[PDB]
Amino acid sequence: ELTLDPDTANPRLILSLDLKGVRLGERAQDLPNHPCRFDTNTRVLASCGFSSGRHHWEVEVGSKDGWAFGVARESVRRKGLTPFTPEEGVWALQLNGGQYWAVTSPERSPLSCGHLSRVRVALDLEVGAVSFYAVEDMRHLYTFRVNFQERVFPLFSVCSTGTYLRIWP
Amino acid sequence: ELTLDPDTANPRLILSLDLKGVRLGERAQDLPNHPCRFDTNTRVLASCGFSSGRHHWEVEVGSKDGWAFGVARESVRRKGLTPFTPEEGVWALQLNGGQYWAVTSPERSPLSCGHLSRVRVALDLEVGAVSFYAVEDMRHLYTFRVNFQERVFPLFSVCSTGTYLRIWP
Numbered sequence: 001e002l003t004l005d006p007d008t009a010n011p012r013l014i015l016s017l018d019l020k021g022v023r024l025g026e027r028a029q030d031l032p033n034h035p036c037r038f039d040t041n042t043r044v045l046a047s048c049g050f051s052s053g054r055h056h057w058e059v060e061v062g063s064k065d066g067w068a069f070g071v072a073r074e075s076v077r078r079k080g081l082t083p084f085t086p087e088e089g090v091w092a093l094q095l096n097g098g099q100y101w102a103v104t105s106p107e108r109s110p111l112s113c114g115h116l117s118r119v120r121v122a123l124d125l126e127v128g129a130v131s132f133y134a135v136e137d138m139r140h141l142y143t144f145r146v147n148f149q150e151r152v153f154p155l156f157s158v159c160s161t162g163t164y165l166r167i168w169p
Numbered sequence: 170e171l172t173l174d175p176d177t178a179n180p181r182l183i184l185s186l187d188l189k190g191v192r193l194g195e196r197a198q199d200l201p202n203h204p205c206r207f208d209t210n211t212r213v214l215a216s217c218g219f220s221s222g223r224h225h226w227e228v229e230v231g232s233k234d235g236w237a238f239g240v241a242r243e244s245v246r247r248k249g250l251t252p253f254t255p256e257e258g259v260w261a262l263q264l265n266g267g268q269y270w271a272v273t274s275p276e277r278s279p280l281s282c283g284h285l286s287r288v289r290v291a292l293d294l295e296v297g298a299v300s301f302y303a304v305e306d307m308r309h310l311y312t313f314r315v316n317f318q319e320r321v322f323p324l325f326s327v328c329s330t331g332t333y334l335r336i337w338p
């Protein structure tokens with residue numbers, strides 16, 4: 001079962017008591033400056049990452065703008081504002097402008113998928129893929145094909161108040 | 170009376186003979202590595218920038234994704250991949266995903282303006298604003314309000330083949 005890693009979380013994020021949920025707050029928490037902590041970008045990783053095999057989880061997503069989630073390679077940079085892009089080691093979907101995106105670069109890719117409530121993330125480290133599905137009807141949203149070469153962690157980001165992400169059984 | 174400054178242009182850009190038009194090509198031109206040149210982001214400035222008063226120009230825009238334009242402060246960073254954001258000195262509209270945006274951060278602002286062919290940029294360095302209008306019917310698209318404190322240059326960016334920007338009388 002995944003849980004969010006509080007040592008990675010940007011200090012403006014609020015992690016739920018059960019460490020499954022994240023939203024953005026107004027307060028910058030006073031937290032230890034661990035190297036694994038995202039000090040500027042509004043990100044948090046799960047506590048455990050994967051090096052091989054197939055793994056899946058589900059993310060409950062808010063209806064309002066401001067979230068992005070998927071996976072990141074461990075070496076994703078933690079300090080400073082870093083780009084949210086595949087080149088920088090993040091493979092994610094995002095909600096911005098009432099629209100859903102795969103965060104490709106330099107052009108984001110529109111999904112045109114309609115409203116999402118819960119998304120299944122399927123990480124395949126044998127093939128080198130990460131895929132996203134809408135849980136309601138399992139329609140395929142997006143797949144990134146990647147030559148993963150290190151440990152890969154579930155990634156969550158919430159850069160606006162009023163939305164959330166939550167890991168769901 | 171604006172022209173694009175070839176010394177600023179990313180080497181993958183193609184500037185028109187009259188230095189009014191820009192598109193992205195496949196070839197990295199062999200150009201001098203002037204400090205003013207954008208070496209990675211797909212940007213070019215006009216040759217002249219403004220420190221006071223009101224100035225306007227028009228930009229013909231392609232229908233396909235990949236452009237952004239507006240204004241940039243002179244101090245906009247030219248080297249490396251740098252964020253395309255107000256905090257980094259760029260105030261711009263963008264076409265990305267069949268969607269028009271004002272490039273706010275951390276969330277882009279959708280314009281929901283319908284198809285654009287030509288856009289008037291009105292830079293007001295007395296008030297501290299840059300505004301964008303659709304030329305068809307002069308409807309107001311967006312205004313950034315900024316405490317400008319240095320010379321501000323017209324900015325153009327084309328990060329995908331198949332689209333263009335052109336300065337229009």
Ligand SMILES: NC(=O)CC[C@H](NC(=O)c1cccc(Oc2ccccc2)c1)C(=O)O
Nearest residue numbers: 041042043066067068084094157158159275
């Ligand atoms: N959630 C998403 O859609 C992914 C984008 C996300 N953006 C940022 O983190 C970002 C980008 C620019 C400024 C910025 O600064 C702030 C810091 C504290 C609170 C609010 C904004 C934060 C990320 O890269 O993970």
Ligand SMILES: NC(=O)CC[C@H](NC(=O)c1cccc(Oc2ccccc2)c1)C(=O)O
Nearest residue numbers: 106210211212235236237253263326327328
């Ligand atoms: N026009 C726009 O919508 C503005 C965004 C624009 N993006 C980039 O420049 C960018 C962003 C990431 C990678 C990248 O690399 C490339 C280099 C050569 C050709 C293609 C892409 C370029 C910018 O910041 O001006």
